[PDB]
Amino acid sequence: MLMPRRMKYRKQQRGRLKGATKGGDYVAFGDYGLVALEPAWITAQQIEAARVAMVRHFRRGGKIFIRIFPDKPYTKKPLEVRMGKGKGNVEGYVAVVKPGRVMFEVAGVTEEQAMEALRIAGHKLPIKTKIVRRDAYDEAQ
Amino acid sequence: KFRVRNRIKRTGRLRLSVFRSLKHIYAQIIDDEKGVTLVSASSLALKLKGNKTEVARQVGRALAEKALALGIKQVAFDRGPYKYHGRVKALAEGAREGG
Amino acid sequence: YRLKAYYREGEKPSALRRAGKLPGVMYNRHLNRKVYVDLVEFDKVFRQASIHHVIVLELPDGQSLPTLVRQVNLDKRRRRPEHVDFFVLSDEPVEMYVPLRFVGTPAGVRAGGVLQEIHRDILVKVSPRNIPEFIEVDVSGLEIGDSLHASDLKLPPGVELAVSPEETIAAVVPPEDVEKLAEEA
Amino acid sequence: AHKKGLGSTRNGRDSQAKRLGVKRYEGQVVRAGNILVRQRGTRFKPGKNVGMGRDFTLFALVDGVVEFQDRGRLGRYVHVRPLA
RNA sequence: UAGCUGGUUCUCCCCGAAAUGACUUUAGGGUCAGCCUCAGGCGCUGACUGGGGCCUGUAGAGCACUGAUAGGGCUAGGGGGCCCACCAGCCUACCAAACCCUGUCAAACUCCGAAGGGUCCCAGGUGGAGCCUGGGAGUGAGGGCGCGAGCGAUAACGUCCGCGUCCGAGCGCGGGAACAACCGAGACCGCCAGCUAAGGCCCCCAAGUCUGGGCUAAGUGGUAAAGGAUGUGGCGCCGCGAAGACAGCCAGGAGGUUGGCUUAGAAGCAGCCAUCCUUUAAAGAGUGCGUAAUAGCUCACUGGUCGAGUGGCGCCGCGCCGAAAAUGA
RNA sequence: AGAGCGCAAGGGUAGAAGGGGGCCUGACUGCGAGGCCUGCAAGCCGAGCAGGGGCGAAAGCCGGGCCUAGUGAACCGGUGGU
RNA sequence: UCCCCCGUGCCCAUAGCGGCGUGGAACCACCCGUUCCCAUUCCGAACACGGAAGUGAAACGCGCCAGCGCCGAUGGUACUGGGCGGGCGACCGCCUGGGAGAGUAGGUCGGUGCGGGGG
């Protein structure tokens, strides 16, 4: 449960997402990598649910590192009030992640630790994903 | 350090670039559009008289009459460091009407 | 090591690629033309030699010329290799990224702590005549809470530097435990 | 229908704009007095026989045709072919 | 009196639009534009593009702007401890500016910057083009579908703008089984004339049970997923192996060791910390089972017996399940 | 050029518009080719003409302030001048 | 006629920076004296007047490590006026015309118009 802090403005429009990711598809940080893969939003619940699965099964292990950051105003409106007035308020602090967008990396474990952790983690997300190693993403700034 | 385009005031619509330094006066008539000058006259690089105050004066006028054989009318005084001290060359008697 | 090559012409990417090949564009100081190679052996061979080492690609035009790759430009969506660029071999003060191998078992480690490496291929210089393969460096007396880096690395004589160099090479960090859920509160 | 006290906004506003920008292009024969450009800042410094009014308006001073010139640290300048 | 309603009638032809902007005690009333049409008066000008000149800040991208930044790192200061009142020596499993480098988020941010678009001058462009006039008008909720922003919940056949257009005015024709806008085509009338578009040849219904090589085994096709599988073909990676594999058999499958430790006891085996070697062909500080914990079945290991293949991974197609509603299919 | 520029934002500017001061008072009378916009009304800029000022020695600058809200057609009456 | 320094306009950061060399007779920075000029919210530091003393350092133009800076193609994607097709959704793919930034090699401490001081 992290985010920015009421920066500049607080309500911002919806979105349609073809495919580009803007980039950010490599190791650089640590080692073994979990790669997100569909055009959608990353849910905070699923942020720290992935963190759950991780330190949950793998406890007293090594270190895990982040590249991402969940921050989106889920413009939600009150119920049964009949549609119209206003936009809504900043719930569902999701983030914007498309296919091929990687995101999570582990370091200081065994191969299988990564493997299993990434399995259950992928079992949690509002979609699904893939996972790989370290060899051909060298040079990426 | 007298940028300010004091020369924008002089980019009015006619110029005349000069200078004064140590023992020499550097007076020249310049037309612009491309930056094509015209006339020349100096203090000591002319073997004139040997006193800055007097020389200054008539040197302006010297060049002026020379310009009268080359054909001009009105321009603008061009310089960066000045405070403006007349220098009764003040290229005014010096043809220009100056001031 | 040795790989194939072929002179490229005025042909377009997708064709060469989606067939089973991959185009490139070599150059060196006084050079900049276009070339290409085959896919499968490209992929395979790049696991080994790579930017770790030097490539000796054979042109059917005769000259089995040794160069180096660099720039590779992925397809970013359903991705993989999709356009390598080639610098060519010289001997001048040239720069590249040397692979590494940190060896040993230190004190932060074993206790449970974990190393955070910040570099494997590093920004350095040399003359291609030299063969400073892959530098295998020091990890004997390491402790959590401290970092090692900078101009503290070994040099196979001749190899100059190209950084600042206070660039952090690595640092040992305290692991993660479910007692960080005591912070969840 | 369990309709409860909602909130009331204010964000129903904006400005209303004219047709701000380059009125005349170059290659167009102008007739002294034609306003040629509207602008806010001194984005385009007026030039040779191109004048300005308080509203940074670059109208035609002479008879002829618009032209442009730019230098690095000086900005964007505009003139007009004069014709005798 | 009615900004509102029901009726308004014979015929041929040439036309052909609105559903948008300013506004209204105005929102279903109406004045101006807007296009229609008519009649007089002018001539490449209209859409469109090659050329060339000039304006943009959007997709996308970008951290150098304005902001957010994950992490390590190091470094300022202090909070602060010991510290001294002649003043300062000093410290920092801390709070941590900056910066660094690992990395990134932005309709109201922009170092960059598209396809372009708009339009200007020369040239092309005779067309229910273009200019002027005035005469008379209707029209001021449009809507389908695409593609693009939005309140919407990436809900509605809610949806307000944007471009685009069909219907409206073409519920005229051919398809879509039947369905104004999903595709094909401007119908002046006749035609027992052939071409032909959408889609079609098993049929009603017009057209090949055509010719050919694979793939599928559910009726997939008749239309579902997250996810799951010795369903099948084809590519490809790695080793064991004729010194003989795999698989089934005899045989050990050990000892310090009951490892440490805790523990009522914890013997490979509840568990946490945990890497030694030895009789060797071969036994793992032991894989699951087992006891109250031992004991015990065990398998990895290894030799043979034996005879020709075998097991695992990555990949591309089709099928499988995930799949339960209210008249009768 | 991140200060600032009167209040908000954008632009933009120290080649000023900001900051210090001397003299003044074009915060001019009667016209204005010309056009942006634009249904209409409206808003807007404007070099140059005759009058006749202020400063700068002059070349020249000023027909209110760096700009975009501080503004309200008509009917009706007060006011002085002519 | 090949030619040495400066008033000075244009090229847009290769022109800018630390530094590295630089000249001085002439140019210039100055130097020098506040008598002349007029000037400072104070100070002759801003500007004039006058020189014999006298500097080449601080200053400019000019010659350089090219670390920083800026210039930066070649090839490919990202998308897309335009056209033709598949979706539980969200999306996509082929053609036509395009072509970034980024990665990259690479490049420069200045290019130049007039006028006057000259080996």
PDB file of C-alpha atoms (C1' of nucleotides) in Angstrom, chain E residues 257-261 265-274 285-291 293-298:
ATOM      1  C1'   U E 257      24.708 -40.735  13.793  1.00  0.00           C
ATOM      2  C1'   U E 258      20.139 -41.565  18.021  1.00  0.00           C
ATOM      3  C1'   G E 259      24.221 -35.299  13.612  1.00  0.00           C
ATOM      4  C1'   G E 260      23.704 -30.767  16.520  1.00  0.00           C
ATOM      5  C1'   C E 261      19.762 -28.882  19.377  1.00  0.00           C
ATOM      6  C1'   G E 265      11.098 -38.570  24.338  1.00  0.00           C
ATOM      7  C1'   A E 266      12.090 -36.112  18.828  1.00  0.00           C
ATOM      8  C1'   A E 267      16.543 -41.519  16.531  1.00  0.00           C
ATOM      9  C1'   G E 268      16.903 -39.724   8.020  1.00  0.00           C
ATOM     10  C1'   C E 269      12.264 -38.654   9.372  1.00  0.00           C
ATOM     11  C1'   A E 270       7.723 -32.807  14.204  1.00  0.00           C
ATOM     12  C1'   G E 271      11.004 -29.309  13.938  1.00  0.00           C
ATOM     13  C1'   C E 272      15.314 -25.335  13.504  1.00  0.00           C
ATOM     14  C1'   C E 273      20.977 -24.965  12.677  1.00  0.00           C
ATOM     15  C1'   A E 274      22.453 -27.585   9.221  1.00  0.00           C
ATOM     16  C1'   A E 285      23.814 -36.012   8.034  1.00  0.00           C
ATOM     17  C1'   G E 286      18.465 -39.564   4.005  1.00  0.00           C
ATOM     18  C1'   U E 287      12.309 -39.729  -0.303  1.00  0.00           C
ATOM     19  C1'   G E 288       7.832 -40.773   1.184  1.00  0.00           C
ATOM     20  C1'   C E 289       5.480 -43.971   4.487  1.00  0.00           C
ATOM     21  C1'   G E 290       5.631 -45.880   9.733  1.00  0.00           C
ATOM     22  C1'   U E 291       6.192 -45.797  15.963  1.00  0.00           C
ATOM     23  C1'   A E 293       9.780 -41.619  19.985  1.00  0.00           C
ATOM     24  C1'   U E 294      12.656 -46.618  18.407  1.00  0.00           C
ATOM     25  C1'   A E 295      11.843 -50.967  15.422  1.00  0.00           C
ATOM     26  C1'   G E 296      10.037 -51.311  10.382  1.00  0.00           C
ATOM     27  C1'   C E 297       8.214 -50.954   4.262  1.00  0.00           C
ATOM     28  C1'   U E 298      11.095 -47.740   1.454  1.00  0.00           C
TER      29        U E 298
END
